[PDB]
């Protein structure tokens, strides 16, 4: 006699909770836009860095897990050093050349966290300028930055990794050929551990801040999620050219 709408009861059960946009009007639009744009360009840079690393001689020779590990530990080193290089190559005081269409002036940075990060980057840029680092030295130093951190217990292809890293150190010495220069450039490589540690800290802070809810692209988000614990686990071993 009376047909019940049985499926509507199941349609009710499966209806998901309303999604939140994450929108907070207290955060200025300019702020939200530059952070979001920087994260988006940043994500695209990690992709570029992964395709670059797959093309580095010796790199493909390591175990897939070690390649994975090295990329997860070094993505911020590669990005910060390339940013220092492009800013140095622009020659303008206090300008950070994130991209040819996104040249930030640190003197226009109103957000204090971003202002602090930019000042460290200006030290990287200032150092490449003081030392007049050539493009050839830069390429060698960038490759060494991919091989600067390892896991506490080491890699699966440790012997081969050490052989490959050794090869790139030798490569840097040849490109320069005064030994003094080597000490100074490897000292600049060593100082990048501190720079990156501050950049990762600001990045991790923003990534977890659910009130600001700045957007992050998918791949940057996975790499940050995998790394955060390690940056507290004491699982990262920094490789130093010099003491200490």
């Amino acid at each position: 006699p009376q047909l019940t709408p049985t499926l509507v009861s199941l349609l009710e059960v499966i209806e998901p909770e309303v999604l939140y946009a994450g929108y907070d009007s207290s955060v200025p639009d300019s702020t939200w836009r530059i952070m979001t744009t920087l994260n988006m360009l940043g994500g695209r840079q990690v992709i570029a860095a992964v395709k670059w690393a797959k093309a580095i001689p010796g790199f493909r020779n390591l175990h897939l897990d070690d390649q994975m590990t090295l990329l997860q530990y070094s993505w911020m080193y590669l990005m910060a050093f390339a940013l220092g290089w492009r800013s140095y190559r622009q020659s303008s005081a206090n300008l950070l050349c994130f991209a040819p269409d996104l040249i930030i002036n640190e003197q226009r940075m109103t957000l204090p966290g971003m202002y602090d990060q930019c000042k460290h980057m200006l030290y990287v840029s200032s150092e490449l300028h003081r030392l007049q680092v050539s493009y050839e030295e830069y390429l060698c130093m960038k490759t060494l930055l991919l091989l600067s951190s390892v896991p506490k217990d080491g890699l699966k292809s440790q012997e081969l990794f050490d052989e490959i890293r050794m090869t790139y150190i030798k490569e840097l010495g040849k490109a320069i050929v005064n030994w003094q220069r080597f000490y100074q450039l490897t000292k600049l490589l060593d100082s990048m551990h501190e720079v990156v540690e501050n950049l990762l800290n600001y990045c991790f802070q923003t990534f977890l801040d659910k009130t600001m809810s700045i957007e992050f692209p998918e791949m940057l988000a996975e790499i940050i999620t995998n790394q955060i614990p390690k940056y507290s686990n004491g699982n990262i071993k920094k490789l130093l050219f010099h003491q200490k």
């Binding site: 992709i47 992964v50 797959k54 897939l64 994975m68 791949m219 996975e222 790499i223 999620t225 995998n226």
Partner: peptide, 10 residues
């Protein structure tokens, strides 16, 4: 991890 892995495996 996963997105990185399939990029590396390509």
């Amino acid at each position: 991890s996963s997105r990185l892995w399939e990029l590396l495996m390509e």
